[PDB]
């Protein structure tokens, strides 16, 4: 199947009471493999997946150096944005950055991304053409002009299409036992008699990896897309995920409904029906 | 592996 490598960065100003907080995390698909936290005693980029541990001292030194440089760029950015928005210096603000690349089943480049947000809102993003920018508002037009003048899109395009895809492949191969593994969901259905004449049928998918999964309910043979209760996929805490889909049905008619589960770990899609 | 050259906003 397809894969992705993504880095996430969070920068939060803590005016008066400390330097800004800087947290960086890296992921290959739904597996976190590295982390950096400016508040930790270490001051080192740290391993979070088993396979990255085969990287040597040079790798760790280089990544630790690049993540500190990112922290400094963000440290400056906080003040720059505060100025653009004529904001007070007593308040706490947040800058977020995310970048990465996706490859297909054949490990060939599919797409790149580089997005930036201020106070939980889009600020500036690199378009899919990896050449131009989408600036959310007016202050972002200022950053956009500086990024065009400095040719930031060309700088990013070189990394995203090259370095990013090369290392993603190296990691997929080095951590194949787990990264290229596929934990098929364990499914079951529960029944809860909610009120007279009705009952809730809840379809479960547990202990699955990767996180992508499609749970659907049909009545007779028709999709019940608009009438299905679907919870956000959640982590189990052991590297796998959980999710459920529920439908409200009339009592005595639960066997007209079928839950369908689609996942990469399953040879073919599963159909569940209440006993 | 992280991006090396990064530009201020």
């Amino acid at each position, epitope marked *: 199947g397809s894969h992705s490598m993504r880095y996430f960065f969070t920068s939060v100003s803590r005016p008066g009471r400390g*330097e800004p907080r800087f947290i960086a995390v890296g992921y290959v698909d739904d597996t976190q493999f590295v982390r950096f936290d400016s508040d930790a005693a270490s*001051q080192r980029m740290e391993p979070r997946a088993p396979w990255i541990e085969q990287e040597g001292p040079e790798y760790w*030194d*280089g*990544e*630790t*150096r*690049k993540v*500190k*440089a990112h*922290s*400094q*760029t963000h*440290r*400056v950015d906080l003040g720059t944005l505060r100025g653009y928005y004529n904001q007070s210096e007593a308040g706490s603000h947040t800058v977020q950055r995310m970048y990465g690349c996706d490859v297909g089943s054949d490990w060939r480049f599919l797409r790149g991304y580089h997005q930036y947000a201020y106070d939980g809102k889009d600020y500036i993003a690199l378009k899919e053409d990896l050449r131009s920018w989408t600036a959310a508002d007016m202050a972002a037009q200022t950053t956009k002009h500086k990024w065009e003048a*400095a*040719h*930031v899109a*060309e*700088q990013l395009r*070189a990394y995203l299409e090259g*370095t990013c895809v090369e290392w993603l492949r190296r990691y997929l191969e080095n951590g194949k036992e787990t990264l290229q593994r596929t934990d098929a969901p364990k499914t079951h259905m529960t029944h809860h008699a909610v009120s007279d004449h009705e009952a809730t049928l809840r379809c479960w998918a547990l202990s699955f990896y990767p996180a992508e999964i499609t749970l659907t309910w049909q009545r007779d043979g028709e999709d019940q897309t608009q009438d299905t209760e679907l919870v956000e996929t959640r982590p189990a805490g052991d590297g796998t995920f959980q999710k459920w889909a529920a439908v409200v049905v009339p009592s005595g008619q639960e066997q007209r409904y079928t839950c369908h589960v689609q996942h990469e770990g399953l040879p073919k899609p599963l159909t569940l029906r209440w006993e | 592996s*992280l991006l*090396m*050259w*990064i*530009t*201020q906003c």
Partner: T-cell receptor
Amino acid sequence: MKQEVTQIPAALSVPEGENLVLNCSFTDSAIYNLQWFRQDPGKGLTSLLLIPFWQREQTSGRLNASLDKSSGRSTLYIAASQPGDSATYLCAVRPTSGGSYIPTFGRGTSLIVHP
Amino acid sequence: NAGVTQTPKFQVLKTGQSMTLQCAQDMNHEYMSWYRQDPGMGLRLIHYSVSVGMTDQGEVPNGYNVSRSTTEDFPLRLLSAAPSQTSVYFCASSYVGNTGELFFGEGSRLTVLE
């Protein structure tokens, strides 16, 4: 590829009024930028031109430089040389991996423009 | 604006004396470095930094100490000057992005004598 920057010839001596060329070669093409400087004995370094990996050339008055990143070389051209151009010209490159951002400098080319 | 500002420009020291060379920049540069250049010789990196709280060694770190508690400053400290440290020192800074253009301070000439 451990980066190594070379500048040959190491010394150059020309009569004023002549256009001239200084050479810079580097072993690893994976550079972020190349920058040309100038330094007189007992003095500091003055930046002349800076060529990012996305540009092919730059111009500043009577000076212009080209960058052939793929073949690992850059050429600084000086038009109608004047005795004031006399100095040691230095070429430096920055890397694209490692997180050190440390520049690699060439030894330099000593230029003497005779009046 | 002011560019890179180094001080002092000239200095004489007796062996064993302490000395701090100041290097300031008002361009919000992330990268700052210190070089020593002996007369007629090449530029040799002593120490560098890419962030507040971060310092790393160059080619000749021995005998020198650096610190980066602020974005603007990168002071070079000589704990106990030796005659071998007589040289011309340059501080250089740049962004860790944009065009990556390097900016040199005007230089500091230090002479250490017995």
